[PDB]
């Protein structure tokens, strides 16, 4: 065991999820009650009443569905809760755009003789939607590309790293190109062979 | 486009630990500090753009606590099954000697939301300037958490993030060294 106090634990979680499609043109509210790791009951605005998910949630669905004022408030919450909160934060969440910092360098490991392993690091950006590609002269490279995938840093930024094994030749230029919603022209950083 | 806002709360016994937070597309907007009874914004500027009355979170948590006691009895005292975390260490950006950077310890896919995280520098605990997030929600109803350590990179220093959790037999140690 890696820590003490092994008494049994009991966990209760509530999640109220507001799902938005095309701005606020379509909104779905999903309320979920979860005991330990098991969802027991939910309110789905597309259904319009509480439903038990497991046997443990049946008494709650029955009780809550018998309260008319409760159901009316819940059915109106896509307006009074979801669309309201969407509006509160839109300018600094939905509209947040932070430009990536892009650097290129050769890896400290050069695992193959006569080859050059190049690294493109893309950091500090928001939102997560991004494309990071390598080009050789004017041609996009699709063999020997390795992407670490998208990493969320926990602080409203992301990073990613994309590596290319190359056989550099005279007159070749390698470019890391980044497409991201914060810029209207792609960012590019070149390594000259 | 698609976006999701989640109000996520929990209560855990016997720890008497509660949490209340809002999440946007997987990032925390704010949480309520239960001891200080105050709204804590994830980025400081958010508090100049928006507000949240922290007493409402406290009222919710009191109901959550009462309901946990109901569910504990209704389930015939069925406790949670521990699920240990997966741990990753990375830096905020490529590291350069003597240019300040930040080590990130990402603790993922675990429950219950109790975890002990220690940064070690050359095998010794470091606390200078560390910070951490609260427990963040996942769609499988497990949790995520981040711990941060600012540092001045050196060729002489090595780092480890040590993670302990009721689901782990031995502590997990994840290493970072200047390349």
């Amino acid at each position: 065991g890696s820590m003490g106090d092994t008494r049994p634990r009991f966990l209760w979680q509530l999640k109220f999820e507001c799902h938005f499609f095309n701005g606020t043109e379509r909104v779905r509210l999903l309320e979920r009650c979860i005991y330990n790791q098991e969802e027991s009951v939910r309110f789905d605005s597309d259904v319009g009443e509480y439903r038990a998910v497991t046997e443990l949630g049946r008494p709650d669905a029955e009780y809550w569905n018998s309260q008319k004022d409760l159901l009316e408030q819940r059915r109106a919450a896509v307006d009074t809760y979801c669309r309201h909160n969407y509006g509160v934060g839109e300018s600094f969440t939905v509209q947040r755009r932070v430009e990536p910092k892009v650097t290129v360098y050769p890896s400290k490991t050069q695992p193959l003789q006569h080859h050059n392993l190049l690294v493109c690091s893309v950091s500090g950006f928001y939102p997560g939607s991004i494309e990071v590609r390598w080009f050789r002269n004017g041609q996009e490279e699709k063999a020997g590309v390795v992407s670490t995938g998208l990493i969320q840093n926990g602080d409203w930024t992301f990073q990613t790293l994309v590596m290319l094994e190359t056989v550099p030749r005279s007159g070749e230029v390698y470019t890391c190109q980044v497409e991201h919603p914060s810029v209207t022209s792609p960012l590019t950083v070149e390594w000259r062979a | 486009e698609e976006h999701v806002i989640i109000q996520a709360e929990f209560y855990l016994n016997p720890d008497q630990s509660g949490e209340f937070m809002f999440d946007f597309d997987g990032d925390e907007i704010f949480h309520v500090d239960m001891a200080k009874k105050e709204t804590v914004w994830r980025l400081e500027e958010f508090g100049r753009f928006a507000s949240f009355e922290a007493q409402g979170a406290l009222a919710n948590i009191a109901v959550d606590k009462a309901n946990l006691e109901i569910m504990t009895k209704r389930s015939n005292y069925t406790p949670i099954t521990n699920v240990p975390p997966e741990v990753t260490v990375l830096t905020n950006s490529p590291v350069e000697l003597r240019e300040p950077n930040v080590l990130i310890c990402f603790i993922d896919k675990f429950t219950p939301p109790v975890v002990n995280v220690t940064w070690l520098r050359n095998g010794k605990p470091v606390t200078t300037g560390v910070s951490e997030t609260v427990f963040l929600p996942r769609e499988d109803h497990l949790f995520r958490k981040f711990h941060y350590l600012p540092f001045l990179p050196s060729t002489e220093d090595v780092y480890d993030c040590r993670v302990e959790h009721w689901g782990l037999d031995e502590p997990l140690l994840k290493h970072w060294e200047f390349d």
Binding site: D60 | S51, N60
Partner: peptide, 13 residues
């Protein structure tokens, strides 16, 4: 601009 929370309901007893 103020965030609004959803209230948590008492379970059946």
């Amino acid at each position: 601009p103020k965030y609004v929370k959803q209230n948590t309901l008492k379970l059946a007893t």
